[PDB]
Amino acid sequence: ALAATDIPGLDASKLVSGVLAEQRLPVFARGLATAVSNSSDPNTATVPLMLTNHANGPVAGRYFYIQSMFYPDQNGNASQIATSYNATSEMYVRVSYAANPSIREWLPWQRCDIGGSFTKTTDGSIGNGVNINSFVNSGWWLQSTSEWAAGGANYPVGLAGLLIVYRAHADHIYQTYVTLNGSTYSRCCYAGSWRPWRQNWDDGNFDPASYLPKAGFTWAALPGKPATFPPSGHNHDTSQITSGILPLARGGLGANTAAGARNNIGAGVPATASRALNGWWKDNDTGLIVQWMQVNVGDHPGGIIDRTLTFPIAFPSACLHVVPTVKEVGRPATSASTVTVADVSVSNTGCVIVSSEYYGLAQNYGIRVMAIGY
Amino acid sequence: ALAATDIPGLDASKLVSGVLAEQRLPVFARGLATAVSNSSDPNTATVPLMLTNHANGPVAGRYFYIQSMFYPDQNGNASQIATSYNATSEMYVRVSYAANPSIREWLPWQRCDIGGSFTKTTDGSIGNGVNINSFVNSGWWLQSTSEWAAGGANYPVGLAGLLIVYRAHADHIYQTYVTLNGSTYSRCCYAGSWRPWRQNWDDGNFDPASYLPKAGFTWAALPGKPATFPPSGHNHDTSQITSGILPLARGGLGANTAAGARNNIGAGVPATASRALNGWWKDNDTGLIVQWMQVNVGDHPGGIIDRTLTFPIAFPSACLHVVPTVKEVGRPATSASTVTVADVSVSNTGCVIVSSEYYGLAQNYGIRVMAIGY
Amino acid sequence: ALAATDIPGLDASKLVSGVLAEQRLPVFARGLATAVSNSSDPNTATVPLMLTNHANGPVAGRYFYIQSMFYPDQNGNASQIATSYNATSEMYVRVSYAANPSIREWLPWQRCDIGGSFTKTTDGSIGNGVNINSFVNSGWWLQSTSEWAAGGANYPVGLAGLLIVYRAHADHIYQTYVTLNGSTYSRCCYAGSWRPWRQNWDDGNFDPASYLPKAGFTWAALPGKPATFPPSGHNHDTSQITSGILPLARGGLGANTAAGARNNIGAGVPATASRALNGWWKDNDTGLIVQWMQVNVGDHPGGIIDRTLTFPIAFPSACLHVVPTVKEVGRPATSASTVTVADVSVSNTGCVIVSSEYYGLAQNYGIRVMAIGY
Ligand SMILES: [Fe+3]
Ligand SMILES: [Mg+2]
Ligand code: NA
Ligand code: NA
Ligand code: NA
């Protein structure tokens, strides 16, 4: 009856068949994270699986399962995958590579689950009465209900929309909001203070067709211009006065005729005359005519003498008066004053003068006559 | 010769050398996902590797390889990594933790491959003839060609650009389009109905410098104004009539001189006169002068008496007529009618009058003379 | 003493206790990536762990640890997880599946680390002096400092902001810049050439209230309109001349009264007259009045006869001259020339004429008188 102590040391090639009970394997080959203490330094890992909250892990204060893959030996270069132990589902990866693989140089852990990314699924649907100032973390959310935007706080407008947040830094937080009608608003939380929502102009809130182009600002295009304009002070030439008759109040004649002009200023026409020895003078205002004339007779023989004298011109209507006097042509014997005259008759053409003497001597007398008529 | 049945049970320490043939290993330590049935529940996993389409996997109806890492034993807390079996290359991670690790509390699967996120590579390049209404899934796509945007359907404009899509919910899908020239449009599919593209105003489609500011709207700034304006009804003062000579047809004199005025209205100048006993009267229209005068002589002694009379003023040209008569200054003895007269000669300065009597008593006569000339 | 060579081939079930020293395990079960050459093709992987830079790995030229999980055997279908060996921390996954699992059909490698995604942490903060043309890779970056944007190159504006980049393709790169005040600019590098930044109009750079609506472009609304306007040429009627007195220089009377007018043109007033046998004539220029009259007497009874004659009108001031002559009414016995006359006295209303005869016969004479005065 052979005992184990009777069996010599064997090479692994002696197991020619069968499958080992998994209890014969080191724990790390069974998926058990129990090979090393649960605070082991993953930087100095030599086992392919551990569970540790060591600070060289990816998240301070948290446990992670850490798988390790090694080359050229378990002290050399390595790749590590860390997966969370509790609280959340997270994965990270890192690597150590060095020319001397034992002098490990670990790169930073890199996140391997989309929990650190902008995801194709939305981060959430926002309810009513929410203050958008609290959305200080990167992501994108839906506001499905305009009333819920209106019922909230710090929405740019009371409309359903899409909120996108970029948290670049605690002091630089950018938010964008796009309404269900396509309008964009943007604001930033700069150094802890939210700046005003900036509103883009779009074809839903501005129409330049309602506003006047500079090219349309012209006199020709101005509507409502009156036909005539109050004139400022200006002068004129008489040639520009084209109708009417200027009255006496304005220094005018009050009429457009010579006779009417004289009548309105009380002026009279000039006189006409023939300045001859047998001449005349006419006042055309009244039509009165005054003529004078003289005739040479000679001696008065005695008794009574009648003579007809013809006026320089005929009186149009009548002779009103005659004034006969005696002229001395010569003084042969006595003066012509010894002859006296008187008018016998008058007509429009002339008169008849009678003469007589009171000395029976010779004379050379003439008859002067002045007449008045119209 | 010994048979295997003669050999007792051996401890693992009996293998002192060599590398086990991998066929001796539990299948999971060889990478074989054959340890359990392919519908096993990963929630109850006790093996480090399985392949299962059980509902508790990450994607309904699909097979996944699921790795499990356990602590403190294979019935306790666990971390799981699921990788796809076919169709796509996907990875998920989850975890179970509990105070009593045997009473597992699984968290939801978290996706690891970037297929679930907005990726730094584009989701694709859009060809010609595509209807953008069909892009209802989150992502971003490239339209490389303006002609293909024009040849498609429901692009905001026929220009190459970038399309970004946010499927926030089946009834809330947001699209943004940025053209190659920087112009942004936005629209939303609300409850399955696409709303109109909203077009932002930018310096590519709007120039405020082309529109008139209110501050530039003034009379002084209005271009195209006329130099003069058609006047409306107004009045004037004579002082504004500054040039020209008003014609008779309008009530004017038709001349700028007093002589020309009289000539144009047919008016004559006024007469002058010296209204004295020995006086004169002149018609300045014709120049005719009439004079009258008297002198006291006294008694007529007899015979023929000559006396010279000097006109008040001298006739400038010639005397045309004289009218002598007799005046009675007094009647000391007899009346002056007994004396008669006649004119002998006449000059420009006066005349000579001859007198005779027919009664021989003492008279006191004078001589009156009236003269006409020019 | 039993020799190992005397021990028969054993089944794995002979190992009833203990844990194998890990040196007994195939290397891949120890986390060692040394089972195959480090250029082995992962498409033909039959071991669960290798390290290779073969072209069929995820990133050309780079080494990756490649884990494999197999079904139904190590030649069949497989899932593979690749993790980086150096330089960066990266993870990838792929799969092979086919109806005949041993004739593999590999799907493309899919990335798992968030390095391939838009992440919820920014890609970096930009310093001063940076040219944004170099940002040709997808991501989002922070410009914290307006001075650093001004001090850089190819920023749209010298303001702090957020830079978002979409590298769709080497020929299609889109950039968006959102300033800390909420203003958005966009540009595109198209086929290797950057195009100008496009500036959106928003309420921070454009206020329509400053610009004039078309509705406000009206004559009534235009400010600064003058009260009066320079008139163009026009004509007038005399009635529009409502004040002033036209002077002689312009063809006017220089006066608004008849008398004044006459004086300014040097004109005289009309004469008046009573054209009767006992009539008168008046020169209203000088006021001189000339009268003529006649009275029939009959016979002269001898002696001295005085007779009063009354002037047709009274001289307003004085009678300056009378001219008496003798008229013949008839010739009964001798002529009226045998009667002579002379004036005795004169008044404003009449005169006294004395008469005598040098015959002693019957006459029928009258007295004519012409008078001058004012
Ligand atoms: Fe005017
Ligand atoms: Mg006159
Ligand atoms: Na005689
Ligand atoms: Na005597
Ligand atoms: Na008698």
Residue numbers in the entry:
A (entry chain B), B (entry chain C), C (entry chain A): 328 to 701
Provide text from the study.
Morphologically and functionally, the R-type pyocins resemble the contractile tails of Myoviridae bacteriophages. Attachment of the fibers to the target cell surface causes structural changes in the baseplate that, in turn, trigger contraction of the external sheath, which drives the internal rigid tube through the host cell envelope. The killing mechanism of the pyocins is not specific to Pseudomonas, and their spectrum is fully determined by the fibers. We found that both R1 and R2 pyocin fiber fragments form a ~240 Å-long homotrimer that contains a rod-like and a shaft-like domain, two tandem knob domains, and the C-terminal lectin-like domain.
